[PDB]
Amino acid sequence: SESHPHIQLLKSNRELLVTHIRNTQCLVDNLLKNDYFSAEDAEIVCACPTQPDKVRKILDLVQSKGEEVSEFFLYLLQQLADAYVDLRPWLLE
Amino acid sequence: MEIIPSESHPHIQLLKSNRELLVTHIRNTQCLVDNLLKNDYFSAEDAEIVCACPTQPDKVRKILDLVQSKGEEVSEFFLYLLQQLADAYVDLRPWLLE
């Protein structure tokens, strides 16, 4: 009840995500569009120099926003990872 | 009848040859439009025209129509974008699938 499974998954996988996420633009934009991130959230993410710093900050914000947003963020990574996957063979050539 | 080389554009041709492949296999047009906007290849107007298209396939057809009409540089950038987007979360796939 004070435990939240999709928050716990993001905490347990912080380094996995930080080190394997290559684009944060798609993520911030979709969080903004779905009213989960505010203009100020996205500015806080900009003020981050490096790409890993940005993932760290996105995860900290997502987590502090609670279970619904943490669940949405993971659903978002699933969708974005699936969006162009069937194309990859052709893209690779 | 003469085929003038400077009037043929290989990245436009790649898109045209792959219309139905792209339409049937691209499942999110949102990250594409947003990147085309951010990079000023798409205008606010372009994104609104695509936004008005009901289905994913309808939006893909519109995006490809617009990209192709904008020419070789935009078409080349669009293919580069699909490559980057196809790679951005590929490493996470095993864990995401589970």
CA distances from A34 to A27, A54, B59 (A): 11, 19, 19
Q: In whole angstroms, what separates CA A20 from the centre of its chain?
A: 11
How far apart CA A75 and CA B28 sit, in angstroms, is 13
The whole-angstrom distance between A77's CA and the closest CA on chain B is 7
Comparing C-alpha atoms, which of A21, A14, A12, A26 is closest to residue A50? A21
> Which CA distances in Å does B82 have to A18, A76, B38?
22, 18, 15
Give A83: exposed, middle or buried? Use CB within 10 Å, 0-12, 13-18, 19+.
buried
Q: Which among B34, B79, B92 has the least Cβ separation from residue A20?
A: B92
Output the six-digit token pair for A37.
């991130």
Structural domains in chain A plus CATH codes: 1-93 (1.10.533.10)
Residue B98, chain A, CB below 8 Å: the answer is no
Resolution in units of Å: 1.9
Q: For residue A84, list chain B residues with Cβ-Cβ distance below 8 A.
A: 25-28, 82, 85-86
* A70 close to A10: Cβ distance less than 8 angstroms: yes
DSSP sequence for A56-75? HHHHHHHHHH-HHHHHHHHH
- Please give the C-alpha separations between residue A73 and each of A21, A93, B50, in angstroms, as whole numbers: 13, 31, 25
Closest residue in A to B31 (Cα) is: A26
Tell me which residue of B21, B16, B95, B46 sits closest to A78, measured CA to CA.
B95
Could you tell me if B15 and B79 are in contact, meaning their C-beta atoms sit under 8 angstroms apart?
yes
Pair A14, A57: CB distance under 8 Å? no
Q: Phi and psi of B36, rounded to 5°?
A: -60, -45
CA B65 to each of CA A80, B23, B45, B46, B56: distance values in angstroms, whole numbers, following the listed order: 23, 11, 14, 11, 14
The contacts of residue B79 (CB under 8 Å, 6+ apart) are A91, B11, B14, B15
Say yes or no: A47 contacts chain B, CB-CB below 8 A.
no
A1 min Cα distance to partner chain B (Å): 24
Query: Which of chain A's residues have a Cβ under 8 Å away from the Cβ of B86?
Result: 84-85, 87-88, 91
